[PDB]
């Protein structure tokens, strides 16, 4: 109770240090545009849902836009890999927003089979395909590359970071769609796995006037 009160500032901090982190130049991309989406679907569901807990209206528009966005990226990232050119989906910056805007109203005009099954039924295989065919390539690479030099193993971990964010939101909201507090848990898990996995580490940890390893 009064002890878990520290779990709200977590859904009002880690999701803001992220929104601001995105809103730096280099951190602006389609991937970190949808991951920055799950920030408003964690902050709003923490400064508007967690406090008072219309209150059950934004409770659905929030969790029905998540596993929906999770369905988005799984496909976007795919279209990026299955793509004949460089790694970075074709979803333009504006059409990413135009596509992002339509993820909310349809999340508002909205069921466990419509807003949960459907979005997770394919999301787990559109990604499965990816995490898999991302392996054949991973080393269809020239062995010599990296040991004699004179998609790579890096972008192979960026799908590790996005591979657990989609792999944690499943073990957190499945026992519920099959415990309502466990679902709230994935509110301080994303800006937590983004530290020891993706670039975010420095992006936001040093934004607070150089955290610690700032050549301390």
């Amino acid at each position, epitope marked *: 109770g009064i002890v878990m009160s520290l779990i709200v500032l977590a859904i009002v901090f880690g999701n803001v240090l992220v929104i601001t982190a995105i809103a730096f130049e280099r951190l602006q991309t389609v991937t970190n545009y949808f991951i920055t989406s799950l920030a408003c679907a964690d902050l709003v569901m923490g400064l508007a849902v967690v406090p008072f807990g219309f209150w059950t209206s934004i409770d659905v528009l929030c969790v029905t836009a998540s596993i929906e966005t999770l369905c988005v990226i799984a496909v976007d990232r795919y279209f990026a890999i299955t793509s004949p050119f460089k790694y970075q989906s074709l979803l333009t910056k504006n059409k990413a927003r135009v596509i992002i805007l339509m993820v909310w109203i349809v999340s508002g005009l909205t069921s466990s089979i419509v807003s949960f099954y459907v979005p997770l039924v394919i999301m787990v295989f559109v990604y499965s395909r990816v995490f898999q065919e991302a392996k054949r390539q991973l080393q269809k690479i020239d*062995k*010599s590359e*990296g*040991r*004699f*030099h004179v998609f790579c*193993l*890096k972008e*192979h971990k960026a799908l590790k970071t996005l591979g657990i964010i989609m792999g944690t939101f499943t073990l957190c909201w499945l026992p519920f769609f099959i415990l309502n507090w466990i679902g709230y848990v994935n509110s301080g898990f994303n800006p937590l796995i983004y530290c020891r996995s993706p670039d975010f580490r420095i992006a936001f940890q040093e934004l607070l006037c150089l955290r610690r390893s700032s*050549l301390k």
Partner: antibody
Amino acid sequence: EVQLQQSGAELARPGASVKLSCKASGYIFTDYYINWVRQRTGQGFEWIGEIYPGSGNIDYNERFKDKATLTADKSSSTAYMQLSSLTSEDSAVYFCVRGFGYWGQGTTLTVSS
Amino acid sequence: DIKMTQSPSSMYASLGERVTITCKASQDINSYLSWFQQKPGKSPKTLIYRANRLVDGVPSRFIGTGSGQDYSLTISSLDYADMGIYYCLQYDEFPYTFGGGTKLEIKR
């Protein structure tokens, strides 16, 4: 001016544990994995494993699977190798290569009472 | 894991002649083989990788050429400074396995 610095001499009591280092300085650390090959006295080479500083992937050779544990330091631009429960037969020269291109200096580790 | 024999072992060539060692692995490394030299009291200096792609700096008299399951390091016009023990390494798959090295001496 390319080089992976190494201790050259390391004494350790049987059962203990040394932690060899290798300060590479002459290229971009994270652009090459660096393996750690062991070459006992007399002759012969036995790869202990390879770690990719950039990522984190550390593919150990079965044999040293639980024996050694590689690790890299992006900042210091030096990498390490944790050798636990050292035994008389763990004594040899431990090399730190840049993926078999440029080898290190070498560390004459020796486990002895 | 993946045995890689390496004939010869011992070998005495005189100055000027073209000496040669031949390496043959168990599997089929896709030209993912390398040749280096160990000189007493020094760390190994690599000469060739990708079965034939000379390293930068290695003298132009070294030649690696094999394919699929058998290769061979070779030098035409053996130079005095060319005394030591060359070994072939395969990095096609884990665990990287070394040859056993053939050692070459010069008849004086």
